[PDB]
Write a protein that binds this DNA or RNA. Structure first.
Ligand SMILES: [Mg+2]
Length: 528
DNA sequence: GACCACGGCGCC
DNA sequence: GGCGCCGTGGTC
């Protein structure tokens, strides 16, 4: 309540306001600090930002990123958001956290500062006795905050000219497809409108409408529905190609070039730390965790991500991290042997259940896929699909046992846990409507494996980052079970070696963790 | 110019 | 299973 002049005492909680949500692009409108119960408001923010030793408060990372932008080394420290997020992943927003635990998220810097000091005490207390959740805060989450700050502030270098050339070329190909579609349509119309396209296909042309949209109940025109109509008419062939190009052009090719920062000449994403229910990171503004890789055009877009002059990119990907984690949690002897002997999984899992059929189940068992789905995709009847599943479990029994065990606990305790003890509360496991319940169950037993893979990758980044500094290298991107680094080409070899070891042995399980590494000048070449 | 819901799709 | 962003359509 008391107002002392700037600056504040040591260890004060920071509050701040931005002109916009992206710290790399925002203008610092005001900052303040709180300690004990009194507030310190800065006359001139950018100047005053140098008096601080660490950014400590709600959204600590954001301010830290902006400080880095200004050439200031202001590391992020404590953040009540991370405490609330560990107590319950559904706590994803300051406004929400405040409205739940107390206080009010306003747009006045001083008010935000006081809010941080109070909410921190509150939540830090609520974390009394919860040692495993406390271990995650000290040893993983809080330290990762500072790593992510350097990733966002470093950005990635982009080949802008390359994407300009590619935009025109792709624009050229879209023109040919739009044309031949209008020809078979008998008239022109908006192809980007699924409402217009529904009419031409299912009414004008005499095509069968197989499925409906969720909320409104219209005849769907999704790629699945379309693929099924591939034989009925040559028009859908071209529409499927049209969608492919438009998607890749509207989302990646056109926008990314226009998001280069002038001060850096690089592209800057945001890594959100309290955004998912399983403990995963998410990415936005822009999302660099969903850059295309599959199709030919998609691969060309990924070549536009390049290293600095005199530097190389280093790409490290875990192999079947989620399946290897399931082996550890399930304790299933057989599945462990497959990994322990270091053999190709999707062939050994076939041999020990009697190729294609082997993969789809391993992929889908984590998601608890429908017996009808395996029948639909693998192009096999319902009974053969339904039998294969029972056959998979007869081979890996402790897996099925682990699923049933997991759900029983979730019904009793109200939550499920990862190996390190990250909680997700899943309510409707005792729902009396089967579809609601069985949906909640799928959410339930998946969380520990996705969440445990997320814990290991997070922990590796924490351990790796100090080592990269000793060698003058950088952490650039993260894609759930992948990392992209940047080293000087003189030392990139050694960095790839060390990074691999750090990731693999981050937390020895019942099986080994394997990492595939590659070095290239662009994101694409650094894998092939 | 802002925001919103929906269908649709990119990635792990 | 877990995300975020696109254009369309509609509203203020
Ligand atoms: Mg949606």
């Amino acid at each position: 309540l008391e107002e002392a002049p700037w600056p504040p005492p040591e260890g004060a909680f920071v509050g701040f306001v931005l002109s916009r949500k992206e710290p790399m692009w925002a203008d610092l409108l005001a900052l303040a600090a709180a300690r004990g119960g009194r507030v310190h408001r800065a006359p001139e923010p950018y100047k005053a930002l140098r008096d601080l030793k660490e950014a400590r408060g709600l959204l600590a990372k954001d301010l830290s990123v902006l400080a880095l932008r200004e050439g200031l080394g202001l590391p992020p420290g404590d953040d009540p958001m991370l405490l609330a997020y560990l107590l319950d992943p559904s706590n994803t927003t300051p406004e929400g956290v405040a409205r739940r635990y107390g206080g009010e998220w306003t747009e006045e810097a001083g008010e935000r500062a006081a809010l941080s000091e109070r909410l921190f005490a509150n939540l830090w207390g609520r974390l009394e006795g919860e040692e495993r959740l406390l271990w995650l805060y000290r040893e993983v989450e809080r330290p990762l905050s500072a790593v992510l700050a350097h990733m966002e502030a470093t950005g990635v270098r982009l080949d802008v000219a390359y994407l300009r050339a590619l935009s025109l070329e792709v624009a050229e190909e879209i023109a040919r497809l739009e044309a031949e579609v209008f020809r078979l349509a008998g008239h022109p119309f908006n192809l980007n409108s699924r409402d217009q396209l529904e009419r031409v296909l299912f009414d004008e042309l005499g095509l069968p409408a197989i499925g409906k949209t969720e909320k409104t109940g219209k005849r769907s025109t999704s790629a699945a529905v379309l693929e099924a109509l591939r034989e009925a008419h040559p028009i859908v062939e071209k529409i499927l190609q049209y969608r492919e190009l438009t998607k890749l052009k509207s989302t990646y090719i056109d926008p990314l070039p226009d998001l280069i920062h002038p001060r850096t000449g690089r592209l800057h994403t945001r890594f959100n730390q309290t955004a998912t229910a399983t403990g995963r990171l998410s990415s936005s503004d822009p999302n660099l965790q969903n850059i295309p890789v599959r199709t030919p055009l998609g691969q060309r877009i990924r070549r536009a991500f390049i290293a600095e002059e005199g530097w190389l990119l280093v790409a490290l990907d875990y192999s079947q991290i989620e399946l290897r984690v399931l082996a550890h949690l399930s304790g299933d002897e057989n599945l462990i042997r497959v990994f322990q002997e270091g053999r190709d999984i999707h062939t050994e899992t076939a041999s020990w259940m009697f190729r294609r059929a082997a993969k789809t189940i391993n992929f889908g068992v984590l998601y608890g896929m429908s017996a009808h789905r395996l029948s639909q995709e693998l192009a096999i009847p319902y009974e053969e699909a339904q039998a294969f599943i029972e056959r998979y479990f007869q081979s890996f029994p402790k897996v099925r046992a682990w699923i049933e065990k997991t759900l029983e606990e979730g019904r009793r305790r109200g939550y499920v846990e990862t190996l390190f003890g990250r909680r997700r509360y899943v309510p409707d496991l005792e729902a009396r409507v089967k579809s609601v319940r069985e949906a909640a169950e799928r959410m339930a037993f998946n969380m520990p494996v996705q969440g445990t893979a997320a814990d290991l990758m997070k922990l590796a980044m924490v351990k790796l980052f100090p080592r990269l500094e000793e060698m003058g290298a950088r952490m650039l991107l993260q894609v759930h079970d992948e990392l992209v680094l940047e080293a000087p080409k003189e030392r990139a070899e050694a960095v790839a070696r060390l990074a691999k070891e750090v990731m693999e042995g981050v937390y020895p399980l019942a099986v080994p963790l394997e990492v595939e590494v590659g070095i290239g000048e662009d994101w694409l070449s650094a894998k092939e």
